[PDB]
Design an enzyme around this catalytic site. Sequence first.
Site, mmCIF file in Angstrom:
data_model
loop_
_atom_site.group_PDB
_atom_site.id
_atom_site.type_symbol
_atom_site.label_atom_id
_atom_site.label_comp_id
_atom_site.label_asym_id
_atom_site.label_seq_id
_atom_site.Cartn_x
_atom_site.Cartn_y
_atom_site.Cartn_z
ATOM 1 N N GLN A 159 37.053 36.638 30.024
ATOM 2 C CA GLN A 159 37.210 35.225 30.362
ATOM 3 C C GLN A 159 35.856 34.714 30.858
ATOM 4 O O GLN A 159 35.378 35.207 31.904
ATOM 5 C CB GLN A 159 38.303 35.006 31.406
ATOM 6 C CG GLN A 159 38.515 33.522 31.608
ATOM 7 C CD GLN A 159 39.417 33.104 32.731
ATOM 8 O OE1 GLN A 159 39.162 33.406 33.900
ATOM 9 N NE2 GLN A 159 40.398 32.277 32.387
ATOM 10 N N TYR B 30 37.215 23.925 37.266
ATOM 11 C CA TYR B 30 35.860 24.503 37.082
ATOM 12 C C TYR B 30 35.055 23.583 36.149
ATOM 13 O O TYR B 30 35.481 22.415 35.963
ATOM 14 C CB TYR B 30 36.001 25.975 36.708
ATOM 15 C CG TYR B 30 36.587 26.816 37.820
ATOM 16 C CD1 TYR B 30 35.965 26.899 39.051
ATOM 17 C CD2 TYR B 30 37.761 27.544 37.647
ATOM 18 C CE1 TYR B 30 36.481 27.671 40.078
ATOM 19 C CE2 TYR B 30 38.284 28.335 38.664
ATOM 20 C CZ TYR B 30 37.644 28.395 39.891
ATOM 21 O OH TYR B 30 38.119 29.164 40.921
ATOM 22 N N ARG C 142 41.508 28.688 27.698
ATOM 23 C CA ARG C 142 42.520 28.381 28.713
ATOM 24 C C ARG C 142 42.345 26.940 29.173
ATOM 25 O O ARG C 142 41.233 26.538 29.581
ATOM 26 C CB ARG C 142 42.437 29.348 29.900
ATOM 27 C CG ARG C 142 43.453 29.041 30.991
ATOM 28 C CD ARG C 142 43.360 29.967 32.204
ATOM 29 N NE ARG C 142 44.468 30.915 32.224
ATOM 30 C CZ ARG C 142 45.159 31.264 33.316
ATOM 31 N NH1 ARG C 142 44.864 30.762 34.507
ATOM 32 N NH2 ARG C 142 46.172 32.096 33.196
ATOM 33 N N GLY D 12 50.390 36.840 35.679
ATOM 34 C CA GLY D 12 49.318 37.114 36.647
ATOM 35 C C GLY D 12 49.794 38.048 37.738
ATOM 36 O O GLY D 12 49.531 39.248 37.675
ATOM 37 N N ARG D 13 50.448 37.498 38.747
ATOM 38 C CA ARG D 13 50.771 38.243 39.990
ATOM 39 C C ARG D 13 51.597 39.488 39.683
ATOM 40 O O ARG D 13 51.382 40.510 40.332
ATOM 41 C CB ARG D 13 51.472 37.302 40.969
ATOM 42 C CG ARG D 13 50.493 36.319 41.594
ATOM 43 C CD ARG D 13 51.146 35.117 42.227
ATOM 44 N NE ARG D 13 51.749 34.212 41.235
ATOM 45 C CZ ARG D 13 52.499 33.156 41.547
ATOM 46 N NH1 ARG D 13 52.687 32.867 42.839
ATOM 47 N NH2 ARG D 13 53.047 32.375 40.548
HETATM 48 C C1 LIG Z 1 44.493 36.612 42.845
HETATM 49 C C2 LIG Z 1 44.480 35.616 41.689
HETATM 50 C C3 LIG Z 1 43.347 35.532 40.873
HETATM 51 C C4 LIG Z 1 43.273 34.650 39.820
HETATM 52 N N1 LIG Z 1 42.134 34.579 39.090
HETATM 53 C C5 LIG Z 1 42.092 33.795 38.009
HETATM 54 C C6 LIG Z 1 40.922 33.741 37.120
HETATM 55 O O1 LIG Z 1 39.965 34.479 37.347
HETATM 56 N N2 LIG Z 1 40.959 32.916 36.059
HETATM 57 C C7 LIG Z 1 42.028 32.137 35.784
HETATM 58 O O2 LIG Z 1 41.971 31.403 34.782
HETATM 59 N N3 LIG Z 1 43.135 32.079 36.567
HETATM 60 C C8 LIG Z 1 43.240 32.915 37.625
HETATM 61 N N4 LIG Z 1 44.416 32.967 38.391
HETATM 62 C C9 LIG Z 1 45.561 32.181 37.970
HETATM 63 C C10 LIG Z 1 46.397 33.211 37.168
HETATM 64 O O3 LIG Z 1 45.834 33.654 35.908
HETATM 65 C C11 LIG Z 1 47.780 32.674 36.780
HETATM 66 O O4 LIG Z 1 47.549 31.474 36.020
HETATM 67 C C12 LIG Z 1 48.638 32.404 38.018
HETATM 68 O O5 LIG Z 1 48.684 33.595 38.864
HETATM 69 C C13 LIG Z 1 50.026 31.950 37.568
HETATM 70 O O6 LIG Z 1 50.667 32.974 36.795
HETATM 71 P P1 LIG Z 1 51.803 33.959 37.460
HETATM 72 O O7 LIG Z 1 52.897 33.021 37.946
HETATM 73 O O8 LIG Z 1 52.246 34.797 36.266
HETATM 74 O O9 LIG Z 1 51.044 34.650 38.595
HETATM 75 C C14 LIG Z 1 44.465 33.822 39.504
HETATM 76 C C15 LIG Z 1 45.617 33.923 40.299
HETATM 77 C C16 LIG Z 1 45.672 34.820 41.376
HETATM 78 C C17 LIG Z 1 46.948 34.871 42.221
HETATM 79 NA NA NA Z 2 41.024 32.563 42.125
#
Ligand SMILES: Cc1cc2nc3c(=O)[nH]c(=O)nc-3n(C[C@H](O)[C@H](O)[C@H](O)COP(=O)(O)O)c2cc1C
Ligand code: NA
Length: 360
Positions: free
Chosen positions: A98, A177, A224, A315-316
């Site tokens: 990414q 961003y 994205r 993600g989480r």
């Molecule tokens: C600890 C953390 C780090 C993340 N880092 C990024 C990132 O580097 N780039 C990005 O596009 N989104 C990032 N996100 C957003 C996640 O990719 C994702 O969109 C978000 O956690 C929602 O998805 P989920 O409900 O499946 O967690 C991050 C989220 C968390 C909680």
């Molecule tokens: Na972040």
Amino acid sequence: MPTLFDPIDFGPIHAKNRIVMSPLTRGRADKEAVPTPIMAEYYAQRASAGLIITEATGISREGLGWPFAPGIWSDAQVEAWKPIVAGVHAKGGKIVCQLWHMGRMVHSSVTGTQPVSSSATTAPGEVHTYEGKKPFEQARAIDAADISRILNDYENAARNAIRAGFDGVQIHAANGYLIDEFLRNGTNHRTDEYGGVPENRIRFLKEVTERVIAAIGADRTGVRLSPNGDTQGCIDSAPETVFVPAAKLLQDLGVAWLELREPGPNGTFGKTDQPKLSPQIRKVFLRPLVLNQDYTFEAAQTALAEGKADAIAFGRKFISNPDLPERFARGIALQPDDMKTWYSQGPEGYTDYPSATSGP
Ligand SMILES: Cc1cc2nc3c(=O)[nH]c(=O)nc-3n(C[C@H](O)[C@H](O)[C@H](O)COP(=O)(O)O)c2cc1C
Ligand code: NA
Ligand SMILES: [Cl-]
Ligand SMILES: [Cl-]
């Protein structure tokens, strides 16, 4: 028709399943933004994902403000990425880098330079630094020279990702961003050809995407977007008037796949009554569409069954369930993720979440 367990092609990337690991900043790289051996273990643990999208990876020192996040502008970064990417491939997995420019969402104490943006704005709240949270600084509005330099950095990062053995890249054009700062009227006050009407607000995303496409191939390029919801001081008041044409443009440029992060009116990583644009985007973007945010196994199975998405990014759940696909396949409970170790430096809350084989 498709389930989470059916394979999918992200251009030439043959994914064994449609369970994507969403991009997650973890801050386990070093202070020179060179990846570390512990990151090889973290990604190898999660290689059963059909596709891994890396943590956001800086295209430049200017565009990387996140303490202990990795970059991919330098030969030392490329060399450190190679074994990480190799460990994933040795497990039959797939991984894309990414590409991150954080725009105004940096502190000069980290970058050495003023934050840069579409316009001279200040992000709300506090910015992470090596010395704790600091007030955000007002950015400077980039000129033609800056735009040429940043396009160069995106090009160099894309080439370095392929050099490190990645299967492709995803342009981070989301979450307030640099690119998203150009897309939204809230953060884009420009009087020139990158400001005003939608097609102008889209031009930066267009030039970044065209440069990456030219460097590594449209078929190896993903994007994205986060159409709906103010993420980090960044709202459009008519998001469909910029996000549907942006997706149309990405279709027209040959972009291999699109991921949309869509908060719900009751999201856990964002809340907004700004509707989801996924259905409208699905009609104008026709290659693999990945949806993300608050998906469960059943919500994801249903999205796919109803043709709303080709795949779902988690993600989480992938923080605390390295074997998420196996858990979904066998009806095993998911382990909770520890928020306190999202962004800390150690293996604790990083590599020490067991699989439903490796421990309790
Ligand atoms: C600890 C953390 C780090 C993340 N880092 C990024 C990132 O580097 N780039 C990005 O596009 N989104 C990032 N996100 C957003 C996640 O990719 C994702 O969109 C978000 O956690 C929602 O998805 P989920 O409900 O499946 O967690 C991050 C989220 C968390 C909680
Ligand atoms: Na972040
Ligand atoms: Cl510095
Ligand atoms: Cl956003």
